[PDB]
Structures are given as C-alpha cells and as structure tokens.
Amino acid sequence: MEIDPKDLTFLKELGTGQFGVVKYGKWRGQYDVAIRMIREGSMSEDEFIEEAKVMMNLSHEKLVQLYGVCTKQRPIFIITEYMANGCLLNYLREMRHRFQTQQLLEMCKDVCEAMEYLESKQFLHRDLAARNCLVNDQGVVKVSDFGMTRYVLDDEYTSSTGSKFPVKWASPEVLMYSKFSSKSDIWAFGVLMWEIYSLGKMPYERFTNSETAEHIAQGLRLPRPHLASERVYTIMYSCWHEKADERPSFKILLSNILDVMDEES
Ligand SMILES: */C(C)=C\C(=O)N1CC[C@@H](n2c(=O)n(-c3ccc(Oc4ccccc4)cc3)c3c(N)ncnc32)C1
C-alpha cells in the first residue's frame, strides 16, 4: 500500500528513535497515524521495501498495524497505527503503582497473541523486547518493529558482539551462532514477561554483555519477580530452556496463559 504524502497532515512530533524521527498526524483528515521518517543510510532501503510488502500483509488486533509507505521521495516514510501511550517500558514505569497483577497478565497475553500470529506466518520478530512494544489509548499492548533488524546496516546493532546488540534478550543459539528462529523469539518473550512483571526493570541491569553471555552459558536465568506467581514464572521460565527444541510454541505458551487466567479468576 503506497500512500500519497499529500494525504498526510503532520500535527505533532513524537520524538526520535533508532530508525528515525517519528511524528503524529492524520491521514486524509480523519485517521490517526504515526509517521516515521527513515534516516538515509540507516537501513537497506530496497531490501526493506520488498519486506515492507510482507509486513503490510501482517494483520492482527495485537500487532501495531503498518498502513503503508511513501517511497517516491527520500527519506521514505513508514505510516503506522498511532499508539497514544507510547513505549511499553514507559507505560510500565508510569503507572506501575496502579497496575493489578491481572493487568500484567493481560499484557503478556496481548504480546503472546501477536507473536502467535507472527509464528503462524513464519515471520520472526528478531528483536522482541519491551523497547518495541507500544500501548494504545485503551491500554492494549501491541508488538512493533517486527523484523526490522534484518535491514539495519549499523555494524554494532547487527553484530552479536556489538555494543548495540540486545544481548540480555538474546537466546544462547543467537549469541553463539546467530541462529534466529521462533525459539529465539520465545526466549525474548520470556524476558519480556520478566520486564512486564518487573515493571520495566532492565534485565541484568548491572551486567555487561559478556557477563550476561557467560551467565546464560552456565545455565543460569533471570529470577522470579516478586510480583510473579509460581504459575506465571513457570511459563516464562519455560521459554529459557537451553535446548531450543524444548521451548514451547507461542500457541502452547498462549494456552498456558489462558489457563492461568481461568485459574486466577
Ligand atoms: C518505544 C517503544 C519506542 C520509541 O522510541 N518512541 C519514540 C517515539 C514513539 N513512537 C514510535 O517510535 N512509534 C513507531 C514505531 C514503529 C513504527 O514503524 C513500525 C511498526 C511496525 C513494524 C515496523 C515499523 C512507526 C512508529 C510510535 C507509534 N506508532 N505510535 C506512537 N508513538 C510511537 C515512541
């Protein structure tokens, strides 16, 4: 879906991310959108444009919807669903004093549903983390930037030894061999659940990249958050099996989450 940039009205700046400065505006006068401006030189644009066609066809209620791109000028624009409440980590860190444990479980369910959709399309996120989940005006958490790191040039972000890499959300098979799969997303999902139930602490907030890799190499894990019940910790902990093939699928993870919701009501 190519959008005509003459149909965009820019209203407010939402700040600047890694891929680009992003603004809030309206599309054809009526529809809320976010508009990302993609910095020249930051992404393999021709490869991204081919992949943008696939992301355009990803559609799930718990996935931030990509509405289209503007590619007949430079910089290219990404037009997406507007998420009034911003980053999940900021959201957790804003009203953490207000959340009920029932609310934290629903957020986990939101992300799991999005990932189950992605898993059903054999589409890897590649960088699942709270830093790319957003929250709408109804408090719904949505997954964002899915599959965006494959097109990033910067050498440190892509490299697994870079100072940009998400070591602390990376599974062993990624850190050792750059072996991405659904099971690497599962690992990250477990870490994300830790972030949600930890009200947005950085995992291993005191550790370097190297020390974290050594920790995971020794088979050690993040601890149970005080706010996490026994059952919920078991689900998230299951995502961190040393053997990728022993980790659950998002469908199985989801059913487990629904089972605890039925159990905790
Ligand atoms: C916090 C999780 C991220 C962050 O750095 N923010 C500063 C600006 C603000 N924000 C956005 O960055 N986005 C957003 C993210 C991703 C896209 O493109 C997209 C979505 C899905 C797949 C690929 C690309 C566009 C814009 C915001 C959005 N949509 N709404 C509201 N605030 C956003 C948070």
Side-chain angles (χ1 to χ4, degrees), residues 2 4-5 7-8 10-15 17-29 31-39 41-49 52 54-71 75 77-92 99 101 103-154 156-162 165-175 177-200 202-225 227-229 231-242 244-261 263-265:
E2 190 70 10
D4 187 338
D7 282 343
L8 305 171
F10 296 71
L11 294 75
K12 185 180 222 301
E13 181 142 41
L14 301 176
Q18 50 185 347
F19 323 128
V21 156
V22 65
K23 304 194 180 176
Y24 164 52
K26 301 285 195 61
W27 179 84
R28 298 189 177 171
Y31 297 61
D32 289 331
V33 297
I35 303 111
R36 168 178 284 163
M37 272 156 207
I38 300 301
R39 202 180 338 283
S42 186
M43 254 139 299
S44 191
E45 293 176 343
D46 294 342
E47 290 178 1
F48 169 107
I49 293 309
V54 172
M55 300 164 75
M56 289 280 348
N57 293 325
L58 294 173
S59 186
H60 189 276
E61 182 191 354
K62 310 299 176 68
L63 204 55
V64 306
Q65 183 67 44
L66 168 80
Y67 296 135
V69 292
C70 308
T71 66
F77 300 165
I78 309 308
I79 312 305
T80 76
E81 180 169 3
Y82 178 56
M83 302 293 289
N85 278 325
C87 305
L88 179 60
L89 227 69
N90 297 125
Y91 187 75
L92 290 166
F99 292 113
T101 58
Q103 291 170 277
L104 295 175
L105 194 54
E106 183 77 9
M107 293 175 336
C108 298
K109 188 168 78 192
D110 286 337
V111 173
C112 198
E113 290 171 350
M115 292 306 300
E116 183 50 22
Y117 175 80
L118 290 177
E119 184 150 85
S120 79
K121 305 293 194 187
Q122 297 172 47
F123 193 103
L124 300 70
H125 190 296
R126 277 173 169 283
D127 193 17
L128 182 67
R131 68 195 145 271
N132 314 291
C133 297
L134 300 167
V135 188
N136 77 3
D137 64 317
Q138 301 302 115
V140 181
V141 181
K142 305 293 186 74
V143 168
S144 185
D145 284 346
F146 36 88
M148 293 284 287
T149 49
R150 183 174 176 82
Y151 314 112
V152 183
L153 305 178
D154 179 2
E156 309 231 22
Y157 288 93
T158 56
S159 188
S160 55
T161 66
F165 198 77
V167 168
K168 288 149 180 179
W169 293 260
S171 60
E173 69 280 1
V174 164
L175 300 171
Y177 311 122
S178 303
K179 193 185 188 292
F180 299 84
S181 77
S182 294
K183 304 303 191 188
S184 52
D185 276 0
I186 294 288
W187 178 287
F189 177 77
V191 180
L192 177 45
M193 292 187 66
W194 186 101
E195 289 181 303
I196 289 167
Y197 273 86
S198 303
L199 303 178
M202 178 193 308
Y204 320 93
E205 165 175 347
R206 202 55 67 181
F207 292 171
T208 63
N209 279 340
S210 58
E211 290 171 337
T212 297
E214 287 186 22
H215 185 82
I216 294 306
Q218 291 177 38
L220 305 176
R221 298 301 184 255
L222 293 164
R224 179 176 102 121
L227 288 307
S229 65
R231 258 229 67 175
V232 64
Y233 182 50
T234 292
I235 299 172
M236 69 182 264
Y237 199 80
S238 76
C239 299
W240 306 326
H241 286 131
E242 190 134 309
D245 181 44
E246 291 304 327
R247 301 176 197 143
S249 62
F250 283 113
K251 187 176 198 301
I252 290 167
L253 285 166
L254 181 56
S255 177
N256 294 313
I257 291 164
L258 290 69
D259 284 346
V260 57
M261 286 181 163
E263 130 179 350
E264 290 178 13
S265 293

